[PDB]
Amino acid sequence: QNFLNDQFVIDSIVSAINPQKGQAMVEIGPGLAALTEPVGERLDQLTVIELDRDLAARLQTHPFLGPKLTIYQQDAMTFNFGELAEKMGQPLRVFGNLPYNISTPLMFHLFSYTDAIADMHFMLQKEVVNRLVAGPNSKAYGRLSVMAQYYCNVIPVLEVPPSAFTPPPKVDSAVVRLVPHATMPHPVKDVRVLSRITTEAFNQRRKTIRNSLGNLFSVEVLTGMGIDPAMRAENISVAQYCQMANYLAENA
Which residues hold S-adenosyl-L-methionine? Predict the structure, then answer.
């Protein structure tokens, strides 16, 4: 719905993405081709996922983009990216102006394909980008920071005012780059457990982890790991959360 319309902003995003011939790029929500056109001009082929049948039909008749485009008229939420990576024969460079509504579930959907994604460049609500990148001991640090950082290097790109879109959104936007780790810095036996620990910790972020994770870790276990039970969810590092996930897997 909120179509990117500012030319300078557009140029700045294209410059950041830096599409190169030979890369397999996939846009989620090409819309009115604000990014599709300039990105596609640098490529021989380009894949898009577009739910609006009206706008998809306009891409197909673009004289230069058309011949280059593979258009999937489906929902990205349940799109099999892992299978698309197999077809393109290489990890995917994903990009797009994402609707605020689906942005967080889509990111987790993409994260689950690990290896299959080279990188991601998404427009999101600015506060979402701040959480994604946040480190411990700050307000923005939460479960999303930890999960997102387990999977990826999180790289803020641009902040974008409402006036850059037509119609304008109600809140500031930002572009973030997400790069799945080539080498996972803190591997976890089973991610569902990491997901569970962070949910429990952050659902009670104004309590010490002694209290919020007391159903899962004794004070002795926490002390043994070098984790201070007087600390709260937001004081615990990504590394420590992963150490807790592995413990709970190697011991329960």
Answer: 2, 4, 29, 50, 75, 97
